[PDB]
Amino acid sequence: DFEVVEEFTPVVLATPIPEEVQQAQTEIKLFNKWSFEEVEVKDASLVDYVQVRQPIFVAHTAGRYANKRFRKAQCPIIERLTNSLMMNGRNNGKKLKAVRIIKHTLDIINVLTDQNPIQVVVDAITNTGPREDTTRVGGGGAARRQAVDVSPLRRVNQAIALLTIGAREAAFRNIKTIAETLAEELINAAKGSSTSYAIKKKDELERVAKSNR
């Protein structure tokens, strides 16, 4: 048929480079394990806000996303998960610890549910983000709520927030750690099991909006 030759000598270097590292020059995988192609966002209106189309090697892109309004809609969603994981007074700044426990939770997500953990966390985002909410229409403070819709950036924000703080309180004083509780949370949120803090909170917010619609 037709084939292109574009290297003309088997490439060998003087510094020995590991075989999986030099295998990573044909496709960029997260932590050299998890592929970014065939990772779709199975809910439209959240594609163009959960970003999985520039593959990365680690969740530590030091780029600047907090100086325009919707610029954090194209931080990769693994890194948005990581950044939301490193928040409380105890664990502020510790992005390498957050990256390391994201690596551990994607390994154990894959070893429990034998599928792509990036696809699992993307399904967890698109199942967790609430599609309706209530504002408090004031009237000076008349305690009545009015149901509003909710924009997709707010849905991705509140999805990552619900998932991460659900993993924290689920790891609060049990035997499991943050990596294992976050793995359980992301798996249950991906399949949508109503056993997770995150989609129970989504179902409560959507049900209250349905109530005082």
Partner: protein, 793 residues
């Protein structure tokens, strides 16, 4: 797309040399620097010849059949051009500085004054093919002792009368048998003999000199041997004669002096018909119409060109250009005219078709740096080095607004709002951007944050975000409107000169001093892609400098860039004699244009002959908003490069059964839509015009509704470039109405495809059709008044 050819040369109506008229004196041929411009003064249009001398041209003549031109430059490199085909026939090097060239009245011979030899050659045919040596020498006469200043043929092409710096004038017969009729020489002048003419009957000879004497010579007895019968004197004391001509049929002697004053006399009685002044600079050229009714004068210092009818004391045109001093240009929002901001302190509004200046504006007391249109051709803003931005109504021609700062700085670039509330301007000594309201006059803001001189400003045309870019290697994006006061700085590799902005406001292309054109996404401030342009730049070698053109760092970067209106291309120019255009998806050079081959300019030759001058540079480039062209403000003038669809067979998915024969069979069999799409797949202008005129009015809307969407910009841009000059006004408006009604949603959702084809259509509706509708409306209302009211006493 990329197949631009040199169309026109706006600005610079005259540089150096002699003006010529046609025989039927409708066009005048004017030597601009090394081109030749031809202005048709009745059919209001103009063109410039494509060919190019290597030095400034000094002599022009075309024969009275109108069929071929010969142009000689200032060291004798003649070029013979076919005047109708507009293609050069021969290049012939006479070896020294030729003062004049003239064709005979019977067209078949020409003579020229090369040094102190009068040499007569005989004219090659226009019908013959090009030979290796088409000119066949008739003779070369040497009787003068110093250089010959002028020729004059007799009415019959039988004698020739030449005038020299040597203080005589001589008459030579063309053929050898009449050598005894013409052997005399005419002495008696104190200075250079500037002209020598016959009378209508070839009995009197008038010889005009530089000091101001005109001698009448007659064949009388005091035997009969050419006495001098009367000497008349001009008595212009300080000034002296710079150019002489004589219309022998109307007995009209026209004389221009070195003081701008020209006088015109009725010669054998020497009565001053008129005396008036061009200006203060000397009158370098006088030329006269064949009927003697128009006089074209050229002054070479300010580059000005009059043609003036002396019966009705009135100037047919007054047109002064700008050599070497032109800082900016801007197309009108329909591509009908170009506004030029020039270094002597003035704005000039040049029509493009007729190559002349309509209005000029002198209220800046220093070099105007930028012009920019706004409010859809109603207002025009300019900023200069005298510290002022100011606004110009192009209806009442009034400077109605003047914006200054508080710091006494000089402004180098500006940018207006789309919704023209705010003007904005940046300097090269202040690091701030000055933001003025246009409605009130006040200084609305001073944006600060650059740490280097703000080289360029541009407002995004759609979302109205300001982009400035400065020599601190930084492009910066300011959200001014609505509570933001938001600043986004994008750093770049080197210091920026000429930012430019996409028509949809999505991206911004900056030119850097490295030599590159980088293209950035505005909203997500990351680089989309760059062109590396410093190796397809023609940087010539100057005469004064002692470093090669390869190692020079003078001009290997672009100081002005501009987007195309579909957003897909960038034209670019700088202080070099190449202008380059690229397509920004592929980042590849489409075409590079050599803007000058004049060796009288400086940076033209890369390699200098091993045996200050005005350098060549382009200061502003812009694309045309209506028709597929660009203007470049070089030192020679406003170079206008445009494609045309008459040449270049470039089909669009034709197959073997798609043929002009097939198209006229489908037209004769009246499948009108099939004939129209066959002509579109041919992409042949005559075939599209033939089918377009053959479709009847009964089924314009069926065809226009069934046109496929890929042939929509072709039929729209065809209708535009056809309907500007075509007479079928109701036919073209029926087609426009049918196309806009049938497919005017596709246009609205594909704006930037039909962004230059729709601007060309409303260049037809408001500029010929609305003028006609205004005339018929005024006639209707004057009728209703003149018959409906009471005229009694």
């Amino acid at each position: 797309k990329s197949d631009f050819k040199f169309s026109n040369l706006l600005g610079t109506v005259y540089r150096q040399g002699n003006i010529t008229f046609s025989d039927d004196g409708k066009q005048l041929l004017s030597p601009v620097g090394n081109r030749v411009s031809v202005f048709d003064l009745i059919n209001n249009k103009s063109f410039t010849f494509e060919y190019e001398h290597r030095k400034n041209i000094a002599a022009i003549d075309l024969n009275k059949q109108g069929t071929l031109l010969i142009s000689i430059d200032e060291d004798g490199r003649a070029i013979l051009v076919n005047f109708k085909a507009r293609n050069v026939l021969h290049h012939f090097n006479f070896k020294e500085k030729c003062s004049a060239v003239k064709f005979s009245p019977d067209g078949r011979l020409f003579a020229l004054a090369s040094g102190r030899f009068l040499q007569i050659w005989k004219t090659p045919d226009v019908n013959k093919d090009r030979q290796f040596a088409p000119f066949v020498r008739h003779r070369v006469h040497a009787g003068h002792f110093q250089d010959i200043t002028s020729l004059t043929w007799s009415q019959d092409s039988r004698f020739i009368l030449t005038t020299s710096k040597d203080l005589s004038a001589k008459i030579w017969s063309v053929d050898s048998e009449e050598k005894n009729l013409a052997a005399t020489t005419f002495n008696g002048h104190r200075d250079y003999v500037m002209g020598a003419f016959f009378s209508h009957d070839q009995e009197k000879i008038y010889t005009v000199s530089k000091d101001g004497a005109v001698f009448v010579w007659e064949f009388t007895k005091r035997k009969y041997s050419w006495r001098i019968t009367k000497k008349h004197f001009f008595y212009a004391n300080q000034a002296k004669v710079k150019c002489v001509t004589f219309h022998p049929a109307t007995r009209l002697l026209a004389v221009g002096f070195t003081s701008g004053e020209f006088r015109l006399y009725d010669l054998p009685d020497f009565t001053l018909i008129q005396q008036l002044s061009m200006g203060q600079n000397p009158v370098n050229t006088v030329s006269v119409n064949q009927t003697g009714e128009w006089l074209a004068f050229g002054s070479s210092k300010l580059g000005q060109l009059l043609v003036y009818e002396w019966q009705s004391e009135s100037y047919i045109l007054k047109q002064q250009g700008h050599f070497d001093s032109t800082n900016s240009l801007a197309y009108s929002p329909d591509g009908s005219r170009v506004v030029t901001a020039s270094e002597d302190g003035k704005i000039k509004v040049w029509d493009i078709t007729s190559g002349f200046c309509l209005a000029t504006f002198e209220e800046h007391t220093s070099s105007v740096t930028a012009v920019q249109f706004a409010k859809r051709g109603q207002v025009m803003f300019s900023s200069s080095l005298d510290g002022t931005v100011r606004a110009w109504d192009l209806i009442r021609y009034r400077n109605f607004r003047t914006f200054t700062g508080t710091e006494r700085i000089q402004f180098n670039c500006l940018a207006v709002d789309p919704s023209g509330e705010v003007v904005c301007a940046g300097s090269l000594d202040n690091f701030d951007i000055h933001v003025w309201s246009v409605q009130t006059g006040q200084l609305l803001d001073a944006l600060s944050g650059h740490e280097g001189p703000v080289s360029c400003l541009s407002f995004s045309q759609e979302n109205s975000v300001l982009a400035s870019a400065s020599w601190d290697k930084t492009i910066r994006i300011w959200s001014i409107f609505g509570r933001s006061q938001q600043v986004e700085p994008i750093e770049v590799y080197s210091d920026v000169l000429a930012l430019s902005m996409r028509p949809d406001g999505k991206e911004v292309a900056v030119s850097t001093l490295k030599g590159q054109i980088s293209i950035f996404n505005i909203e997500d401030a990351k680089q989309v892609g760059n062109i590396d342009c410093r190796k397809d730049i023609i940087s010539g070698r100057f005469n004064q400098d002692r470093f090669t053109a390869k190692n020079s760092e003078r001009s290997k970067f672009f100081t002005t860039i501009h987007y195309s209106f579909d957003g897909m291309a960038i034209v670019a120019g700088g202080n070099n004699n190449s202008i380059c255009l690229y397509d920004v998806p592929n980042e590849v050079l489409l075409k590079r244009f050599i803007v000058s081959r004049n060796m009288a300019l400086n940076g033209t030759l890369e390699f200098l002959n091993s045996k200050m001058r005005p350098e060549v540079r382009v200061t502003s480039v812009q694309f045309s908003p209506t028709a597929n062209a660009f203007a470049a403000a070089s030192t020679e003038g406003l170079l206008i490069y445009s494609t045309n669809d008459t040449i270049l067979f470039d089909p669009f998915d034709l197959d073997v059964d798609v043929t002009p024969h097939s198209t006229v069979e489908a037209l004769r069999e009246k499948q009108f839509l099939n004939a129209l799409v066959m002509a579109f797949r041919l992409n042949e202008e005559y075939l599209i015009n033939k089918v377009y005129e053959a479709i009847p009015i009964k089924e314009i809307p069926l065809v226009a509704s069934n046109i496929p969407a890929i042939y929509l910009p072709r039929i729209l841009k065809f209708i535009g470039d056809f309907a500007i000059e075509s007479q079928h006004i109701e036919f073209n408006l029926i087609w426009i109405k049918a196309l806009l009604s049938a497919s005017g949603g596709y246009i609205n959702e594909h704006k930037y495809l039909f962004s230059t084809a729709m601007r060309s259509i409303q260049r037809f509706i408001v500029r010929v059709a609305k003028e006609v509708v205004n005339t018929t409306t005024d006639n209707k209302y004057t009728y209703r008044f003149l018959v409906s009211t009471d005229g009694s006493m």
